[PDB]
């Protein structure tokens, strides 16, 4: 063999490609032709039979009153379609049909409802937005081509060429066509040349390491390597200056492309996926929290964001030292080879249970009798490894009160100027001297929150909830002692605000428990989620499309609705607004959430009926940005008594200019500066069907459908190369369940965990890997001190009962 | 006989300008033959201008000078909108023909054509409607493609009268104005395409035979791609399970297939649909086959490209296939420079069979191959030339001007020029090759084709376009010389 000889031989083998292609296409045409369908739904008679030609001769006078239209007919004959004569013109009477229904007010995209704000990815323009026809070499052609150029200038500026995209697409198709031929051809040639040998040669050839390192790590370098000769011959035949180098095929190959204190280190390594992805807020591994980088890489709001497992696990152990037997042959008759994964299970459980509930019973329930794990635990001989600060003059965490020049001493309540930083996770005090971001990252200190690793006893910036307690209504926008939470523009914490009682009232299961909400906490409206009854209609403002109308009486001070949508950056907002624009001729659904941070809410597609509230400087509702369990949210509050049937309005603010109807940096958007269909002169619509509503009829209220959203989160997990199939399986199952609960507080985690354990009892005990992955979750939640011991004891009973029933 | 016969221009008409007081503004954007008449009934089509619906009947004549086209109905949409879309349905009670017309106002007007009345209006879209298609499995099911970027599925059945929108194809599948919508023969799959250059395949659920307070909303297509074309897509159709589509600036009609797609397989549910997880993947599919040497197997295969020269920068030009059991499948399309093209798809197979036999005989007989036309038997031809000579039967339609004849006067094989000319029209070996039309007819004047229509028996092909012009092609005519 030589290059010349291989190339000559590949040229003959390559003849199979157009031969097989023609066989495929022809076979497909013939199968389609054979399976042609019989016409269906044919009428018994010709419905047109009784209808005569309406033609009136050209020579006749035109009919009186009725409109007439001319048609000129030509007859043709021969091979070249020559006209038989100049033609004949006829007059036809016209049947004039007036439309009787107006269209609904205009819109773009399908408007779907979301219960909560959803996180969006950054996007690129992948097409040519056609607006109208433009005459060649005109002012309009120039205006249009300048707008397209501006759009292209935003994508280059985003951080993410036509001729190359066309060439690449054409090369990708030709690579897919040739890839099934490589191995049959290599066998036919029988050169002492295999795909593995050709991948090895490619890896040992320029041109990026450590990607080439990763490949050689699995492939190695291994007599006479004439992989070079085959590679050259292939490039001579298939990569002519539809072309493809052997490299391009090999890079897309299934065996190539995807390859692009000891106890504690084992535990850290074992829990990696859970600590890296597990959300501190909602407990899901793919959710609406976290940050999206310019390249669409995601930084989850996880344990990793706060230093990983160890800083949190060490603090738990300290908090422990400063403070019934199981129904599975408990260690009580104390003291089959144990696999590596079984040893590991006992290890991460032992570590996270800490200086406590015993790991034995739980490990036995996940894996084995309780005594078996007790003696292995003794065989393995496993072992576990306040500088008084002055109170701030502007804040008292014991009394839960703000004082002095506090409005100037902090920016905790000034969400518009806040920049987001990871919760603090350092050892020493929370000061500028010790690099604490809560104390020093902003223009003024902000309070330390629930995820900061410091505690209320040692830290003077630690938020400790409000002191409010009343047999009547409390945590009011105007109170004896005022509500610190209301003053800081935040909702009450179900855990920190004890006895107000945000615990019961921020619980969605009590949303419509009217007797409960008549007393206690009045500062959990977003968490409660009970919006006022509203109805879509046509706005009273002239040529102003849709508007939102009250469908019940709303008293001044009442929560109306939340503004939901997609969470996007300022830059994504600019890209979106410009792509949807028209340089030759208005509607925006943007809302600034966090001005300084650059977080906007876009309700163009996903949101709720609040996206339809029109502008009025003198509105009857008022938006406000609230901090709600480390989520920033927009709520609307009534600023007048509103009657059922009245249109809702709010002042959009200073950053939305041309709103005159009454009665790259510049981004316009809103900013903070038996239920029946109600009686109104205005047409009212069902939000989905767009059918009109009749006043006096039941108000349509469709439950939110989030199965499409749960699907997206499941699929996001499935596409991770970093996750192992056994992990994907458990994480997808846990998230499908937990995402539905819309959790933002640890207070409700134990109840939902128990319900998960009770429901998935059978699924979990059925496969050894599920129980293993489940124990890793429990370990991460215990390390975080979020999961109480009592629920882990209960889960042991539920799991031990699940198997055995399975026998 | 005459199964190989292709159409010839028979009639043409110009319908009076109806838009000049509201680029030359008057166009016939659509043409649709009535599909529910009994077998053998005179074919009827509706041609839709910006303001009118022209309903014609075609009758075969024995007189070359006689007019086969008669206008039996002429309706004016007395609104202040330009129409561009139509499809046929039937009254669920009387079985009378219903003509649906839609345009830039965003409403579907449903006309009782025999009586000249408005039967009903379908209201709900947020922008102009660009295309309409009736389901082949249910005549009461209509899909509309709109500038609002969604597809609405409507039912004219009495049980859905109060709320006729049964389904909305929404989510983020499409991001710009939709130009084309098409149903599979089974009525469960829908193809959509437009300005965003994405071609989406959606799976429709079964619609209950009762009042639906809300339509069923579909968030994800089961197959999605913006990779078949590099430009806006203005025409999409199924051809059995295969797909036909055209884009602007390409001068082709692309025949392709979704890998792993079979309409014999159970219909996937909404949650089987892939989701756009990676923004860098411009193709996604639920159908993808699991066996391939590629890590991410190919999700579609370009099969062939019908050459459609001189479309230039023009868009909103639609092609149409004649696909009926017992007759040859014929593709028709008119370009932006006064030409009508025809392809007889059954020619491909006979040509392929003839060239396979010709290639086999050349190798087995060292080029000693005599070709004889079909219409003399193979057996009797073999006796004439002897055992040393290979005999190949050639289709009679394959007319002269695999290796070429050694010299011009050789008794074996064909000239390079003959073989090249045939390959241009019939060779299907190259997915990025250009298939020359089997018939190309010149049109007098300047004409841009908008839509093509075939009669149930395929004897008529109507092409409509600019200047409100209709071109009527015929085959298997009764004209006497």
């Amino acid at each position: 063999w030589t290059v010349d000889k291989i190339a000559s031989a590949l040229s003959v083998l390559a003849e199979e490609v157009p031969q097989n292609h023609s066989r495929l296409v022809n076979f497909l045409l013939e199968e389609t032709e054979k399976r042609a369908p019989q016409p269906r739904h044919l009428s018994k008679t010709d419905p047109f039979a009784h209808m005569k030609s309406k033609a009136i001769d050209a020579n006749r006078p035109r009919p009186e009153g009725v409109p007439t239209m001319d048609v000129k007919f030509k007859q043709h004959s021969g091979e070249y379609g020559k006209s038989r004569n100049s033609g004949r013109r006829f007059q036809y009477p016209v049947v004039c049909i007036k439309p009787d229904r107006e269209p609904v007010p205009p819109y773009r995209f399908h408007h779907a409802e979301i219960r909560k704000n959803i996180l969006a990815l950054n996007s690129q323009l992948n097409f040519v937005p056609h607006l109208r026809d433009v005459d060649p070499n005109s002012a309009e052609e120039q205006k249009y081509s300048a707008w397209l150029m501006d759009l292209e200038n935003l994508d280059s500026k985003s951080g993410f060429p036509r001729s190359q995209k066309i060439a690449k697409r054409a090369q990708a198709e030709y690579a897919a066509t040739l890839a099934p031929y490589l191995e049959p051809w290599l066998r036919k040639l029988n050169i002492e040349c295999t795909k593995s040998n050709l991948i090895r040669f490619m890896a040992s050839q320029p041109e990026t390491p450590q990607q080439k390192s990763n490949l050689l790590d699995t492939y190695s370098d291994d007599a006479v390597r004439n992989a070079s000769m085959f590679t050259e011959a292939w490039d001579r035949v298939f990569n002519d200056q539809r072309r493809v180098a052997l490299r391009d095929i090999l890079m897309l190959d299934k065996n190539v492309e995807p390859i692009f204190e000891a106890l504690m280190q084992k535990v850290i390594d074992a829990l990696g996926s859970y600590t890296t992805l597990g959300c501190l807020i909602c407990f899901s591994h793919d959710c609406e929290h976290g940050e999206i980088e310019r390249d669409n890489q995601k930084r989850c709001f996880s344990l990793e964001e706060i230093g990983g497992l160890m800083p949190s696990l060490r603090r738990k152990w300290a908090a422990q030292i400063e403070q019934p037997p199981c129904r599975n042959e408990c260690y009580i008759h104390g003291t089959p080879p144990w696999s590596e994964n079984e040893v590991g299970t006992l290890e991460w459980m032992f570590a996270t249970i800490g200086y406590s509930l015993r790991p034995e019973c739980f490990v036995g329930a996940i894996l084995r009798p309780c005594w078996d794990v007790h003696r292995k635990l003794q065989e393995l001989d496993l072992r576990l490894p306040i500088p008084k600060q002055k109170s701030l003059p502007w804040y008292d965490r014991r009394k839960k009160q703000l004082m002095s020049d506090w409005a100037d001493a902090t920016i905790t309540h000034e969400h518009a100027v806040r920049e987001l930083f990871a919760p603090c996770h350092h050892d020493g005090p929370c000061t500028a001297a010790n690099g604490c971001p809560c104390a020093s990252a902003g223009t003024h200190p902000v309070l330390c929150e629930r995820f900061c690793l410091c505690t209320a006893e040692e830290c003077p910036l630690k938020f400790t909830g409000c002191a409010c307690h009343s047999s009547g209504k409390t945590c009011l926008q105007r109170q004896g002692r005022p509500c610190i939470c209301v003053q800081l523009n935040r909702e009450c914490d179900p855990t920190l605000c004890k006895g107000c009682g945000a615990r019961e009232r921020a619980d969605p299961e009590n949303a419509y428990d009217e007797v409960l909400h008549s007393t206690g906490c009045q500062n959990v409206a977003l968490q409660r989620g009970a919006a006022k009854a509203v109805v879509l209609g046509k706005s009273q403002l002239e040529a102003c499309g849709y508007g939102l109308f009250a469908a019940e009486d709303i008293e001044e001070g009442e929560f109306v609705i939340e503004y939901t949508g997609e969470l996007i950056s300022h830059d994504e907002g600019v890209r979106r607004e410009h792509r949807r624009g028209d340089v030759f001729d208005k509607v925006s659904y943007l809302f600034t959430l966090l001005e300084q941070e650059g977080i906007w809410v876009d309700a163009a597609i996903y949101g709720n009926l609040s996206r339809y509230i029109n502008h009025a400087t003198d509105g009857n509702i008022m938006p406000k940005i609230m901090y709600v369990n480390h989520e920033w949210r927009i709520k609307f509050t009534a600023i007048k008594d509103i009657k059922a049937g009245e249109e809702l309005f709010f002042n959009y603010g200073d950053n939305f200019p041309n709103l005159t109807k009454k009665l790259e940096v510049m981004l316009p958007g809103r900013g903070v500066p038996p239920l029946l269909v109600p009686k109104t002169t205005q047409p009212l619509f069902d939000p989905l069907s767009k059918v009109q509503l009749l006043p006096g009829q039941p108000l349509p209220q469709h439950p939110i459908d989030d199965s499409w959203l749960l699907l997206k989160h499941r699929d996001n997990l499935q596409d991770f190369i970093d996750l192992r199939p056994e992990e994907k399986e458990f994480l997808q199952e846990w998230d499908a369940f937990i995402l539905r609960r819309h959790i933002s507080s640890e207070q409700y985690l134990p109840r939902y965990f128990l319900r998960f354990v009770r429901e998935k009892a059978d699924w979990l005990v059925s496969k050894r890997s599920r129980g293993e992955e489940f124990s890793k979750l429990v370990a991460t939640l215990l390390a975080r001190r979020v999961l109480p011991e009592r629920v882990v004891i209960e889960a042991t009973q539920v799991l031990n009962d699940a198997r055995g029933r399975l026998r | 006989s005459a199964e190989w016969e292709l159409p010839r221009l028979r009639t043409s008409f110009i319908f009076q300008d109806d838009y000049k007081y509201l680029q030359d503004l008057a166009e016939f954007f659509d043409v649709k033959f009535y599909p529910y008449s009994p077998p053998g009934a005179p074919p009827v089509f509706a041609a839709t201008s910006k303001k009118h619906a022209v309903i014609c009947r075609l009758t075969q004549t024995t007189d070359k000078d006689a007019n086969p086209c008669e206008i039996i109905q002429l309706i004016r949409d007395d609104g202040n909108e330009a129409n561009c879309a139509s499809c046929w349905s039937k009254d669920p009670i009387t079985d009378q023909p219903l003509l649906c017309i839609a345009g830039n106002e965003g409403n579907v007007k449903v006309y009782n054509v025999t009586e000249g009345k408005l039967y009903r209006t379908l209201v709900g879209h947020g922008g102009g409607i660009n295309d309409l298609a009736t389901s082949p499995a249910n005549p009461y099911i209509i899909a509309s493609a709109s500038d609002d970027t969604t597809i609405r599925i409507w039912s004219l059945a009495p049980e859905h009268e109060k709320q006729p929108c049964v389904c909305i194809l929404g989510g983020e599948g499409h991001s710009y104005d939709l130009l084309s919508v098409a149903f599979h023969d089974n009525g469960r799959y829908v193809l959509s395409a437009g300005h965003d250059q994405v071609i989406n395949l959606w799976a429709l659920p079964e619609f209950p035979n009762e009042h639906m307070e809300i339509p069923i909303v579909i968030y994800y297509p089961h197959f999605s791609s913006s990779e078949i074309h590099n430009n806006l897509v203005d025409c999409v159709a199924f051809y059995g399970d295969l797909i036909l589509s055209r884009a602007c600036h390409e001068d082709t009609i692309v025949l392709w297939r979704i890998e792993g797609f079979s309409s014999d397989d159970p219909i996937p549910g909404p949650l089987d649909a892939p989701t756009p997880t990676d923004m860098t993947k411009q193709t996604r599919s639920y159908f993808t086959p699991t066996v391939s040497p590629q890590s991410r197997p190919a999700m579609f295969t370009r099969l062939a490209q019908f050459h459609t020269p001189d479309c230039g920068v023009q868009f909103f030009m639609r092609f149409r296939m004649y696909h009926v059991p017992g007759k040859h499948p014929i593709l028709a399309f008119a370009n932006a420079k006064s030409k009508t093209f025809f392809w007889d798809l059954a020619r491909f197979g006979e040509y392929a069979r003839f060239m396979a036999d010709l290639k086999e005989a050349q190798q087995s007989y060292n080029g000693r191959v005599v070709v004889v036309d079909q219409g003399i038997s193979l057996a009797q031809a073999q006796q004439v030339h002897g055992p040393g000579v290979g005999v190949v039967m050639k289709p009679a339609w394959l007319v002269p001007k695999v290796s070429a004849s050694p010299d011009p006067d050789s008794p074996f094989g064909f000239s390079r020029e003959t073989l090249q000319a045939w390959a241009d029209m019939y060779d299907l070996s190259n997915p990025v090759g250009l298939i020359k039309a089997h018939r190309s007819l010149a049109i007098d004047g300047a004409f841009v084709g908008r839509q093509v229509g075939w009669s149930p028996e395929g004897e008529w092909c109507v092409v409509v376009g600019n200047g409100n012009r209709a071109l009527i092609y015929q085959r298997w005519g009764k004209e006497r010389g």
């Binding site: 026809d133 433009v134 060649p136 | 030359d24 166009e27 806006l232 920068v313 023009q314 300047a446 200047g467």
Partner: peptide
């Protein structure tokens, strides 16, 4: 350069 919907 730019696509056109109307007849030329």
């Amino acid at each position: 350069k730019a696509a056109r919907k109307s007849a030329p």
